[PDB]
Amino acid sequence: CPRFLKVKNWETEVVLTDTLHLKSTLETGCTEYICMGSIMHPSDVATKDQLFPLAKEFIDQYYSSIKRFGSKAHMERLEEVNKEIDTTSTYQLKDTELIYGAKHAWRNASRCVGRIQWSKLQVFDARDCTTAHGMFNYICNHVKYATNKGNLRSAITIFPQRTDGKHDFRVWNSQLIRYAGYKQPDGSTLGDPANVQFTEICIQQGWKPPRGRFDVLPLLLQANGNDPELFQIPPELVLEVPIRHPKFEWFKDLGLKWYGLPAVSNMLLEIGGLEFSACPFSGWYMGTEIGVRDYCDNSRYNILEEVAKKMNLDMRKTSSLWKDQALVEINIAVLYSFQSDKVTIVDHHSATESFIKHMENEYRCRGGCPADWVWIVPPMSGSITPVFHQEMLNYRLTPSFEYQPDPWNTHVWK
Amino acid sequence: RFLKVKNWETEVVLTDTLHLKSTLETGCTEYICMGSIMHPATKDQLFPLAKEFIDQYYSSIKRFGSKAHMERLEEVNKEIDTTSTYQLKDTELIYGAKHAWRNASRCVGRIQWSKLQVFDARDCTTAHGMFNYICNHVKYATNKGNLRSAITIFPQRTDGKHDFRVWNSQLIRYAGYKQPDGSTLGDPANVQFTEICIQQGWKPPRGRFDVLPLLLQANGNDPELFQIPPELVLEVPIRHPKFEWFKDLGLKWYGLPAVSNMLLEIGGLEFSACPFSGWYMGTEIGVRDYCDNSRYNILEEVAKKMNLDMRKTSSLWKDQALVEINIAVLYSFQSDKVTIVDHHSATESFIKHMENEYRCRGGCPADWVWIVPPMSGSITPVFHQEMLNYRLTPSFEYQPDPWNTHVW
Numbered sequence A: 001c002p003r004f005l006k007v008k009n010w011e012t013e014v015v016l017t018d019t020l021h022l023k024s025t026l027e028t029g030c031t032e033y034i035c036m037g038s039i040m041h042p043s044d045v046a047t048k049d050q051l052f053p054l055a056k057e058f059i060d061q062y063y064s065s066i067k068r069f070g071s072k073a074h075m076e077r078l079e080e081v082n083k084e085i086d087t088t089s090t091y092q093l094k095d096t097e098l099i100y101g102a103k104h105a106w107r108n109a110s111r112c113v114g115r116i117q118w119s120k121l122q123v124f125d126a127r128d129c130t131t132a133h134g135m136f137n138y139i140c141n142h143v144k145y146a147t148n149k150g151n152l153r154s155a156i157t158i159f160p161q162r163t164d165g166k167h168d169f170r171v172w173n174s175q176l177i178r179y180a181g182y183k184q185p186d187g188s189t190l191g192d193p194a195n196v197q198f199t200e201i202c203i204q205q206g207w208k209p210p211r212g213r214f215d216v217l218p219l220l221l222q223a224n225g226n227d228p229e230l231f232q233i234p235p236e237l238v239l240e241v242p243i244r245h246p247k248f249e250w251f252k253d254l255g256l257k258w259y260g261l262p263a264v265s266n267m268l269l270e271i272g273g274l275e276f277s278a279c280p281f282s283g284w285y286m287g288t289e290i291g292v293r294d295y296c297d298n299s300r301y302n303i304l305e306e307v308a309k310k311m312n313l314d315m316r317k318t319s320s321l322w323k324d325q326a327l328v329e330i331n332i333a334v335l336y337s338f339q340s341d342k343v344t345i346v347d348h349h350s351a352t353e354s355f356i357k358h359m360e361n362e363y364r365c366r367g368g369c370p371a372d373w374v375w376i377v378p379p380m381s382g383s384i385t386p387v388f389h390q391e392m393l394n395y396r397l398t399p400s401f402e403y404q405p406d407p408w409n410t411h412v413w414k
Numbered sequence B: 001r002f003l004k005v006k007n008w009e010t011e012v013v014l015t016d017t018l019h020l021k022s023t024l025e026t027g028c029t030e031y032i033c034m035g036s037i038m039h040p041a042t043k044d045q046l047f048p049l050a051k052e053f054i055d056q057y058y059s060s061i062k063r064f065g066s067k068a069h070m071e072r073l074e075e076v077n078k079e080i081d082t083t084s085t086y087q088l089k090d091t092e093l094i095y096g097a098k099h100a101w102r103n104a105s106r107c108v109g110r111i112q113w114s115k116l117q118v119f120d121a122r123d124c125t126t127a128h129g130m131f132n133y134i135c136n137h138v139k140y141a142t143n144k145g146n147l148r149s150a151i152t153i154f155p156q157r158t159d160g161k162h163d164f165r166v167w168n169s170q171l172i173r174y175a176g177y178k179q180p181d182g183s184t185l186g187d188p189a190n191v192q193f194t195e196i197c198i199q200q201g202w203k204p205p206r207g208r209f210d211v212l213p214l215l216l217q218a219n220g221n222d223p224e225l226f227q228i229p230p231e232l233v234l235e236v237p238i239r240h241p242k243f244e245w246f247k248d249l250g251l252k253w254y255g256l257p258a259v260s261n262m263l264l265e266i267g268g269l270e271f272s273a274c275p276f277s278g279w280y281m282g283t284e285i286g287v288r289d290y291c292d293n294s295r296y297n298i299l300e301e302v303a304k305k306m307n308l309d310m311r312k313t314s315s316l317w318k319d320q321a322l323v324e325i326n327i328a329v330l331y332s333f334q335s336d337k338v339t340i341v342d343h344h345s346a347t348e349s350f351i352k353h354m355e356n357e358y359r360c361r362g363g364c365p366a367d368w369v370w371i372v373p374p375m376s377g378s379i380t381p382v383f384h385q386e387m388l389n390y391r392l393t394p395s396f397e398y399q400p401d402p403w404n405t406h407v408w
C-alpha cells in the first residue's frame, strides 16, 4: 500500500483522503488480481504468544483514545495484562475497555449504514453469567430496555468470553426475536422460510409450536459449553406492528405484521484477541430490511404477487414493472405503520444521507471509514440515494464483529 | 485454487478456474478492497503481450502449436523488430473485439457478445474519413429500430502523438448549457463538451435536447466538427400508458447508445478510437439519465403532476415517481418498435450467461457493483448472485479526456 488513498463522490465531486487503512488488520479475500467484494463470507483457541501482541495493540489504542498514551497507567495496564496472559493464557478487560471495544466494533462494522449512532450504545456487561437461565434473564432485560415502548435504544449484552473453546456461551437464535417457519409435507412453507432449520431444532428440543404465520421463536441458550436450553420470551416484551397502507383499505386484509426490534445474536465480538461468542446487539430497523428483503425476497415471505393482484396491475409482461410498483407500496405501508404506532424506524433516504455525513466526519476526525458498498447501498432505489455515488474503501479494523459457525454444527452434545 | 460462487436465492454453486488465467490487476490488495472505486510500451514489452494474444487466438480455433501458429508468431516477432509495432489479421481483429466485450466485467449485456458487427476502419487517415465510417456505423446499428450491435475500429496508437480520438463520450448525446442564472439547460453531463464545440464554431440551437455535433481527431491533428445527418438519428418521444399528461413533459431520448470515449486493447496494441454500440437497458435512461441529480433531474416535476406528498421523504414519493418514469420509457420504446430491454429480462439473461460461461470457459468476470441495476436491485436475480471480478485481455479501458492532453 501507499500512505494515502483517495475516494470521490461522483454526485458532488467531494474528495476524501483515507489514512486509517494503514491500521487494517486481517485479510479481505481480495488480491491484486481478484476482487471478492460481493462474496457473502470470504474465509480451537489462541496461544499465549498469539495473544500478547493483540492485547497490546488494543490497549495502546484504548489509552490513545483517552489521551493518556504512554502514561503511567498505560504502562501499568500493559504490565498487568502481560502477566495475566503469562500465568493464565488469557486476560480480563476492565469495564471501561469492554465498553470502548463494543462501541468500536460497531464503529468499525463496514456493512452497517446505521453507524452515525455508534457512540450511543448501551453496553450490558454480562460476564458474571454462569447458566442459561441467567442468560435468559439478561436477554429479557436487554429487550425491555432497548424496546422502551417504541422509542428504541441501541444496546448490546456481552456474555463471558471463550476460554478453551469447550465452554462457549452461545445464542443459537440468529436474532433474539424472529418468526418461525414450518416446512409442510406438500413442499410449501408456513411462516418465515429463512428460519425453518432453526425451528426444527427448537421443536426437537421440545418446543410446542402454534404452527401459525407469525409465531415468535423461543430463545435457545447455551452457557459454558453445556447443552442448550429453551425459554419463552414473555409476549408482553415483544413489540409488534400490524402493517396497513395509508391509501389501500385492503392492505390490512393481507394480515401482515413485523416485530419492532432487530437484534442479531449469532455473531462474534472480538476485542484485543478475546472472543465473545455470545453478544446480542440491537438498534432499530431501516424500512427496506422489512419491506424489501423480509417481505419480497422470493425465499422469504414473498408477497409481491399477492400485493400486485390486489393492486390490479398487469402481471403478464415484466416490462409493466408490476413488481417494481408493488414493492414501493409495500415499503410505504411498512413506514406508515411503524410511524403511526410511534415505533422508531428510518427510511432508506434519511439513513443513507446520514451515513454520508457520518462518513465524511469520520474521514476528518479518524482518517477514514471502512464501508462495504455492496451492503451500504439499499436494496431498492439505489441510484437515488447518495451512497450509490460514493466511492468507498473496505478493510477490516479491530475490535470487530465476525461471523461464526452455527452452534449445532459444532456442539459436542453432553 | 479453484473458487466457488454461490447464488443465495437458488443455491446454485459454480466453480471459477478462469481467474487463474488473468494477468491484469484489479485495484484491490489483501488488506483493502476497492470494488467500488470507478477508476482504480516499447519493442521489449510488446512481444510477450503479442505472443499471449496470438496463443489464445490459436487456442480458440483449436490449432495451438500448428504450423500456422508458429509462423504467425515469427511473423509478429520480425514485424515488432523491424517496425516497433505490428498489425493484426482481420480474423484476429474480430476475435479481439468480441472478446474485449466478453471480458467486460461491468456489462450486463454480454449474453450477446459473439453477435457483434466489426467494422475495420484501420485504413482511415482523416477526420472526414472518420465521419464517414461513423455515419455508416450509426446507420447499420440503428437498422430502423431493430438495433444491431457494432463496433468501428480506427488506427492503433503509434508514437502517441498521432492518436485517433472521438472526442464525444457517445456518438449521439444531448447538449448542455450554462444559463445566465446558474441553472443548466439540457444535459449537465455534457456542459463542458458543449462549450468546446461552441468554441470550435458550433452554432447551438440552445434547446433541451439538441443532438451534439461529432468532434473527430485523426492522426493527432486538431479535431474537426461534423453534423450527423438528422435522418440517421432515431429518437423516441416519451409518453406514459396511463398518465396522459406525461407527454406534456416534452421528454424524448435517442434510440442508439454508442460509447465512443474508451480504448480497446488487443495483443498489446492500443485502439484509442473504437466507438461501440448495442441497445439500452431501460434504467440507463429512466433512472440515471433522467433522475440523477447531476443529470436531467426530473423526479420532482413528475411527482408534482402525480400530486404526491412531497414534504416527507418517508412517503417514498421519489420511489413512486421513479417507477412511473421507467414505465414510460419502456412503454414508449416498445410502441415505437425500438429495441430496448427491461432490467428484469436483462439480469435474468446475465444469470443465464454466467451459467454458460462457467460451463464452457470455466468462469465469467463480473462487477457486482455495476451489474446490479440502479433500482429494484434485490428483486432482480443478480442481487443474490455472488460474483468474482478479475481483468482478462483483450479489454476495454478508460483513457483520459482528449482536451487535457492535446496541444493545438
Ligand code: HEM
Residues within 6 Å of the ligand: A102, A105, A106, A109, A111, A112, A113, A114, A115, A117, A121, A154, A155, A156, A281, A282, A283, A284, A285, A286, A289, A346, A351, A375, A401
Ligand atoms: C441503530 C440503528 C441501526 C441501523 C439503522 C442499522 C442498519 C443496518 C443495516 C440496514 C444493515 C444491513 C443488514 C441487511 O441488509 O441485511 C446493518 C448491518 C450491520 N450492523 Fe447495523 N444498524 C443499526 C444498529 C447497529 C448496532 C447497534 C450494531 C452493533 C452494536 C450494528 C452492527 C451491525 C453489523 C455487525 C452489521 C453487519 C451484519 C452482517 O455482517 O451480516 N448495527 N445495519
Ligand code: HEM
Residues within 6 Å of the ligand: B097, B101, B104, B106, B107, B108, B109, B110, B112, B116, B149, B150, B151, B276, B277, B278, B279, B280, B281, B284, B341, B346, B370, B396
Ligand atoms: C447489446 C446490448 C447491450 C446492453 C443491454 C448493455 C448493457 C450495459 C449496461 C446496463 C451497462 C452499465 C452502463 C451504466 O450503467 O452506466 C454496460 C456497460 C458496458 N458495456 Fe454493455 N451493453 C450492451 C452492449 C455492449 C457492447 C456491444 C459493448 C462493446 C462491444 C459493450 C461494452 C460495455 C462496456 C465496456 C461497459 C462498461 C462501461 C465502463 O466500464 O465505463 N456493451 N452495458
Ligand SMILES: CCOc1ccc(-c2ccc3c(C)cc(N)nc3c2)cc1CN
Residues within 6 Å of the ligand: A174, A262, A263, A264, A266, A281, A282, A283, A284, A285, A286, A289
Ligand atoms: C444476509 C443475512 O445476514 C445478516 C443480515 C442483517 C444483519 C443485521 C445485523 C444487525 C442489524 C441491526 C443491529 C439493526 C438493523 N436495523 N439491522 C441489522 C441487520 C445481520 C446479518 C448477519 N447474520
Ligand SMILES: CCOc1ccc(-c2ccc3c(C)cc(N)nc3c2)cc1CN
Residues within 6 Å of the ligand: B169, B257, B258, B259, B261, B262, B276, B277, B278, B279, B280, B281, B284
Ligand atoms: C462513468 C460511467 O461510464 C460509463 C458507463 C456506461 C457505459 C456504457 C457503455 C456501453 C454501453 C452499451 C454498449 C450499451 C448500453 N446499453 N449501455 C452502455 C453503457 C460507458 C461508460 C464509459 N464512458
Ligand SMILES: C[C@H](O)[C@H](O)[C@H]1CNc2nc(N)[nH]c(=O)c2N1
Residues within 6 Å of the ligand: A037, A038, A039, A040, A374, A375, A376, A377, B008, B383, B384, B385, B386, B387
Ligand atoms: C451476492 C451478494 O453479495 C448478497 O446477495 C448481498 C448483496 N448486498 C447485501 N446488502 C445488504 N445490506 N444485505 C444483504 O443481505 C446483502 N446481500
Ligand SMILES: C[C@H](O)[C@H](O)[C@H]1CNc2nc(N)[nH]c(=O)c2N1
Residues within 6 Å of the ligand: A010, A388, A389, A390, A391, A392, B036, B037, B038, B369, B370, B371
Ligand atoms: C461509486 C460507484 O462506483 C459509482 O457510483 C458506480 C456504482 N455503480 C454503477 N453501476 C453502473 N451500472 N453504472 C454506473 O455508472 C455506476 N456507478
Ligand SMILES: [Zn+2]
Residues within 6 Å of the ligand: A030, A034, A035, A036, A037, B028, B032, B033, B034, B035
Ligand atoms: Zn476487492
